[PDB]
Structure 1
Amino acid sequence: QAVVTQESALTTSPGETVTLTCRSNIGAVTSSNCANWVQEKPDHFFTGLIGDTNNRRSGVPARFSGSLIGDKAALTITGAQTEDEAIYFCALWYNNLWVFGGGTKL
């Protein structure tokens, strides 16, 4: 089961709180898993959008923080914008390797 999953349509506005889920199905995505809502750009630009499972993702926008929120690692883009609007790739790791789930296109 490879899911950093969330609500499939859960996005913010330009500057809006893009609050996607990137979590496991039985609970949360890990923090040492880094359950995050990372960036997903044109051409599938994976990166830390909101990463590290309690923390922000630098290189993604200034709003993006993958934390404990929603029902998972809540990828809360507090000011996720038109440039920050992309696939919040929900990442769940096992503490040995991080696997992106589906993500929520905000």
Structure 2
Amino acid sequence: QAVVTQESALTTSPGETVTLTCRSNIGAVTSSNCANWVQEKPDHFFTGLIGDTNNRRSGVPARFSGSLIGDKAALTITGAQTEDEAIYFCALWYNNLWVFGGGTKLTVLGQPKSSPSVTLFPPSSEELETNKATLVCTITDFYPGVVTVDWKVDGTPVTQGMETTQPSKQSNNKYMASSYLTLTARAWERHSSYSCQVTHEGHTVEKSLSR
């Protein structure tokens, strides 16, 4: 292994300069060791631009260069995106091939999301013939998505019955996702005023049912 060590947390701004630090933890950089830093796109799609201390990115903002900074890959990137949150990878390629250290994950300002856009309904009767009930209560594109979910059919949130699905964020900071109330069929007939009461970023999504 190896450690081209910089700030492995990365916090940017609107149009923010991703200064992907990696000073060499052993010491000083070279182009034979390939101290480079290329920015990484969504879904963990690292695509190396600032290559080995010699190159910029192909089609990216022009302010990005992973080059010799300190004694390692200092990647000065001025003029980043509003929703370009991704892993600016510090690659070290020691004259045979590129092995990774950590790489600074960069998430910036510009275009914050909303509350979770409410899709909160007790769903169609396919579960009610199995003696089951899975109502779908969720948000879509919530931001800052710190979700508080009270999931209890029959109105009051108890620790069973509820369920949260994956609340997943995009590149542009939109992170709203689903969950269910998962109880019986005649038990889903026993209570009808159920839901999932969600809240992220000051915006509160009402998942309420009718049965």
Cα deviations across residues 47-84 of structure 1 (Å, max 9, x unaligned)?
Answer: 12322314322244322210112452101112122344
In the superposition, the TM-score normalised over structure 2's length comes to 0.43
Q: 55-64 or 42-51: which moved more?
A: 55-64
TM superposition score normalised by structure 1:
0.77
Over the aligned positions, Cα root-mean-square deviation in angstroms equals: 2.3
Shift of 1:88: 1.1
Deviates more, 1:55-64 or 1:33-42: 55-64
Unaligned runs of 5+ in 1: none
**Displacement of 1:19:** 0.5
User: Does 85-94 or 5-14 show the bigger shift?
Assistant: 5-14
The CA distance in 2 between the partners of 1:91 and 1:98, in whole Å, is: 6
* CA displacement at 1:29 relative to structure 2: 4.3
Kept in 2, the 8 Å contact 1:32–1:53? The answer is: no
Contact 1:50 1:77 in 2 (8 A): no
Alignment length, in residue pairs? 105
Q: Deviations over 1:16-45 (max 9, x none)?
A: 221112353112443233312212222221
Percent of matched pairs sharing the same residue: 100
CA distance in 2, matches of 1:28, 1:56: 21
Distance 1:22 1:91, change over 3 A: farther
Q: Which residue of 1 aligns with 2:33?
A: 33
- Asked whether the 8 Å contact 1:56–1:65 carries over to 2, the reply is yes
- For structure 2, list consecutive stretches of 5 or more residues without a partner in the other structure: 106-211
Retained in 1: the 8 A contact 2:39–2:86? yes
